[PDB]
Amino acid sequence: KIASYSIPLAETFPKNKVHWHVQADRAVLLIHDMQKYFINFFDHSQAPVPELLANISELKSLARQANIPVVYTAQPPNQDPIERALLTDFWGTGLTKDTEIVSELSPEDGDIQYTKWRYSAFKKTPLLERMKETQRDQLIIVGVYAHIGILSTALDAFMLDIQPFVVGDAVADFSLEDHHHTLKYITERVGCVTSLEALKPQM
Amino acid sequence: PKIASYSIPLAETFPKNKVHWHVQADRAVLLIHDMQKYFINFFDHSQAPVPELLANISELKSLARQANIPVVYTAQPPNQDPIERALLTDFWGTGLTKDTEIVSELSPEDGDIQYTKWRYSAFKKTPLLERMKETQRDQLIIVGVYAHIGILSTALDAFMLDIQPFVVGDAVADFSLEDHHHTLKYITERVGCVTSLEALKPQM
Numbered sequence: 001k002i003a004s005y006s007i008p009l010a011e012t013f014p015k016n017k018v019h020w021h022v023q024a025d026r027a028v029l030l031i032h033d034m035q036k037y038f039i040n041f042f043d044h045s046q047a048p049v050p051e052l053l054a055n056i057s058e059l060k061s062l063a064r065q066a067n068i069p070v071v072y073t074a075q076p077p078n079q080d081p082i083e084r085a086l087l088t089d090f091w092g093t094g095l096t097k098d099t100e101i102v103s104e105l106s107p108e109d110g111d112i113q114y115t116k117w118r119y120s121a122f123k124k125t126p127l128l129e130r131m132k133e134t135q136r137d138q139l140i141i142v143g144v145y146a147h148i149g150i151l152s153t154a155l156d157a158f159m160l161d162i163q164p165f166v167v168g169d170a171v172a173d174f175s176l177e178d179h180h181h182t183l184k185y186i187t188e189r190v191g192c193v194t195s196l197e198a199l200k201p202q203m
Numbered sequence: 204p205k206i207a208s209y210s211i212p213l214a215e216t217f218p219k220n221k222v223h224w225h226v227q228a229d230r231a232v233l234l235i236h237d238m239q240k241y242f243i244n245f246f247d248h249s250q251a252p253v254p255e256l257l258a259n260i261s262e263l264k265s266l267a268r269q270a271n272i273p274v275v276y277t278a279q280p281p282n283q284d285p286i287e288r289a290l291l292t293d294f295w296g297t298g299l300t301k302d303t304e305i306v307s308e309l310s311p312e313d314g315d316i317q318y319t320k321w322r323y324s325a326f327k328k329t330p331l332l333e334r335m336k337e338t339q340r341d342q343l344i345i346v347g348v349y350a351h352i353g354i355l356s357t358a359l360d361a362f363m364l365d366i367q368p369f370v371v372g373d374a375v376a377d378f379s380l381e382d383h384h385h386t387l388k389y390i391t392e393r394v395g396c397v398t399s400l401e402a403l404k405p406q407m
Contacts, residue, residue, distance in 0.1 A: 018293045085365045089222045090393065118363040119393075148393060152359055159322040159356070161289045181385070189294065189323075189352060 004046040005176040007055075010195035012180075013168045014187040020138075020163050022194075022202040027165075028136050029063040030121060031056060031072045032143030032150055034105050036098035039144070048172040048179075053104045055170040055196050056142050060105065066203045069136070071127065072107055073116040073143075074099060083117065119152035128160055138163045140199070146173035146182040154190045164191035167199060208250040209380040211259075214399035216384075217372045218391040224342075224367050226398075226406035228270040231369075232340050234325060235260060235276045236347030236354055238309050240302035243348065252376040252383075257308045259374040259400045260346050264309065266407040273340070275331065276311055277320040277353075278303060287321065323356035332364055342367045344403070350377035350386040358394050368395035371403065 034056065042049050063070050077096045084094055107113060117124040131137065139157045141150055141164055150171050154164035166186045173179040183193045238260065246253050267274050283298025311317060321328040335341065343361045345354055345368055354375055358368040370390045377383040387397045 020293075086362050086367065086395075089224075119359065120363060123363050147389075152363070155323070155356055155359065158290055159324060159327050163290065185351075191290075 002042045002174055004043060005048055005179075007048045007051045007169050007172065008176065008180060008183075010169060010197060013193055013195065014184045016187050016192055018192055020165070020192045022138055022140060022165055022199060024066040024068055024203055026136055027068050027138040027140055027203075028131060029060065029068050029070045029140045030142070030153065031060065031070065031101075031105060032121060032141060032153060033073055033075065033116060033145075034102050034143050035074050035095075036100055036102055037075070037095040039102050040098060042172070052144075052170065052172045053102065055167070056105055059140070059142060059167065059170055059196060059199065062200065062203045063140070064108070064110075068140075068203065069134070070107070070111045072101055072111060072113045073121045073125075073149075074101065074113055075116045087118070116149075119149045120156040121149070121153040122156040122160060128162075131162060137161065138165065140165045140167065142167050142170035144172050145178075146171045147178040151182050151185065151190075154186060158190045165194050165199070166191065167196060168193045169195050204245065204378065206246045206378055208247060209252060209383070211252040211255050211373050211376065212380065212384060212387075214373060214401060217397050217399065218388045220391050220396055222396055224369070224396045226342055226344060226369055226403060228272050228407060230340055231272045231342040231344055232335060233263065233267040233272050233274045233344045234346065234357065235264065235274065235305075235309060236325060236345060236357060237277055237279065237320060237349075238306050238347050239278050240304055240306055241279075241299050243306050244302060246376070256348075256374065256376045257306065259371070260309055263344070263346060263371065263374055263400060263403065266404065267344075268312070268314070270407045272344070272407065273338070274311070274315045276305055276315060276317045277325045277329075277347075278305065278317060279320045291322075320353075323353045324360040325353070325357040326360040326364060332366075335366060341365065342369060344369045344371065346371050346374040348376050349382075350375045351382040355386050355389065355394075358390060362394045369398050369403075370395065371400060372397045373399050
């Protein structure tokens with residue numbers, strides 16, 4: 001059960017080492033694991049969940065207007081233990097219900113959903129293959145949880161020659177400490193930490 | 204950066220493991236991650252964590268060879284093609300050009316394997332997964348530098364590729380003690396097993 005916390009302000013975000021900028025023709029918006037199951041660990045009516053949903057919703061609308069593909073990731077229910085593998089040792093047998101995307105962020109016509117198996121959105125999915133085929137090499141990452149799946153996805157993007165853009169105010173985590181630590185790690189070793197405000201004109 | 208001296212934390216300060224895995228010689232591979240002169244040069248060798256780091260990796264390599272546990276070294280190549288190096292330049296500059304050899308204390312002996320390292324993860328653009336699948340080895344003992352960068356990414360890829368990572372807390376070093384401790388905590392909580400040289404000895 002995640003204790004309530006406020007999404008940090010863009011002024012507290014660490015400074016970027018890299019000077020990348022989102023270009024609509026090169027970008028993909030990834031809404032990472034925004035399933036009811038994962039959001040249920042927080043009190044939905046409490047911070048960081050209302051700001052997280054409002055910021056992702058605004059960014060998603062902007063992506064659709066800019067012709068930026070929207071990709072959702074979702075873990076499947078009743079996973080085969082062989083397929084789930086070493087995750088069981090840390091998290092148990094996994095979700096059986098609430099596999100749907102939170103109603104506030106329900107996918108619209110044209111949006112794509114990929115079945116998620118590991119922390120990284122690139123493991124066992126068509127994401128790299130689709131990014132290569134469409135010449136898209138920039139990944140805008142939003143969702144939960146910053147230090148786990150968001151971090152692993154960004155690390156993979158980076159290693160696969162895809163520029164990761166982690167939206168600091170459109171991610172949530174187990175705590176504010178974990179949230180801040182992830183942004184610091186991204187700016188220092190993986191990619192770009194951006195904000196809804198900085199990102200808005202680049203799209 | 205020039206890494207300021209720090210002592211490798213003691214096994215009792217290590218965070219508690221969530222998982223209860225144990226190294227089995229028939230299933231394990233020892234990965235000596237980026238123990239190149241170039242990377243060790245950022246520390247003052249004559250000061251901590253380096254003498255303990257080299258002695259502990261040397262002791263562990265010796266046990267592995269006796270246990271027939273394959274020893275795999277990773278090394279970044281010099282004068283890298285910018286296309287192949289890709290986004291790493293944006294963070295660390297162009298590919299290293301000198302001191303690509305493994306530190307003399309840990310020089311590979313006959314039978315050891317060396318893989319050319321391209322990314323933080325030792326699994327990217329290498330035969331590592333393919334060789335482990337083939338030899339039925341699903342446990343990776345990870346030692347070397349730097350804990351929060353290459354050690355961490357290799358461990359994350361291991362876990363995601365169904366390989367049990369065993370990070371030896373007292374056989375790794377980092378940019379600081381803070382980074383070293385944060386990595387071990389992250390491993391125990393989300394990725395795998397944080398072990399020590401003393402705890403691995405009876406398992407080997």
